[PDB]
């Protein structure tokens with residue numbers, strides 16, 4: 065099976081123990097069949113693909129520091145990903161749709177600039193993690209031209225493929241969280257144009273999108289205990305949609321996340337950690353290592369769960385508790401309510417090594433191509449949790 069390891073290159077410069085330098089990156093490669101360098105973006109002025117940190121990626125060679133790892137792992141394939149929900153540009157918020165709707169000269173400039181990034185820096189191919197409009201989050205028509213945009217995406221993909229053919233470069237698509245495949249992906253047509261598709265079947269709910277209630281963010285199956293939950297928001301619904309639309313199972317990778325979605329609780333959120341958790345208050349305080357409100361790395365979540373340091377501590381120093389449905393269909397929960405001396409309540413939806421292993425077992429049951437892991441920088445690459453480095457990645461590899 066494949067194990068496609070995403071690498072968010074912003075991790076190279078993080079301040080503190082979330083910093084992922086190249087020796088730690090290399091430790092992962094014994095488990096990964098592919099490494100995907102994230103992320104290039106689109107220029108606001110002309111929609112060309114470009115490095116969002118040229119000083120690092122180009123002038124200090126981080127692109128080729130990563131692609132040259134093929135010298136040490138000769139079968140490793142290294143791709144460059146465009147977009148990924150990491151091209152954040154509030155003053156040019158329409159770039160991805162404008163490229164679809166673009167004049168030929170604008171699209172050709174994107175195709176050529178992408179090609180040149182792949183070739184110049186030693187990549188084996190390109191990942192289009194296209195930043196489509198997402199499902200509208202439900203409180204408590206996004207795109208009137210979706211059908212046109214589907215057709216334009218097929219054509220763009222066809223044109224990107226053509227640019228890659230003579231060199232033999234790979235082309236993948238990533239369907240990002242809450243990107244709706246019915247709206248945008250002509251699945252049977254895309255099958256002839258791309259080598260594989262990663263379905264990012266996680267972050268179905270997040271505190272940024274869903275600040276006032278919390279629910280499982282990456283279940284395999286639909287949780288009937290999640291009152292009123294939208295039925296398409298689960299990994300099996302997404303995978304079965306791609307299979308039923310005609311995509312070969314061996315060309316699909318199941319997306320698994322190494323980070324968790326963390327909500328701030330209130331007293332009114334009550335004492336049940338099984339979701340839906342009501343009356344939440346947006347994102348949890350950022351972790352000191354990951355420094356993103358509402359996200360936590362696996363190491364940060366592990367450090368919050370019971371361990372010999374914190375097991376007897378009280379109030380806001382007490383452990384988060386594990387909530388785990390015995391059927392194992394839905395994923396991990398780390399939880400501490402607002403109660404008593406505890407004033408900082410938190411609910412985290414995440415995969416730990418065991419639930420990530422179960423995602424890999426589901427991939428195998430459905431005869432998928434493998435798993436795509438988002439991303440190495442939030443796996444515990446230093447082994448802070450148990451001493452074992454990359455416990456999530458290894459749990460998935462073990463099962464493939």
Ligand SMILES: *[C@@H]1O[C@H](CO)[C@@H](O[C@@H]2O[C@H](CO)[C@@H](O[C@@H]3O[C@H](CO)[C@@H](O)[C@H](O[C@H]4O[C@H](CO)[C@@H](O)[C@H](O)[C@@H]4O)[C@@H]3O)[C@H](O)[C@H]2NC(C)=O)[C@H](O)[C@H]1NC(C)=O
Pocket residue numbers: 199244245246247286288294295296302305
């Ligand atoms: C793209 O987004 C659209 C929404 O904008 C999404 O369409 C939604 O799909 C879900 C799943 O197919 C639909 O919900 C189902 O609706 C039927 C018909 O009313 C219900 O009977 C279903 O209830 C059954 O299944 C549940 C889980 O198995 C059970 O728990 C439940 O009791 C029933 O047994 C279920 O609610 C929803 O109607 C549409 N919405 C619209 C507006 O079309 C589409 O799936 C998204 N595409 C992708 C690929 O994600």
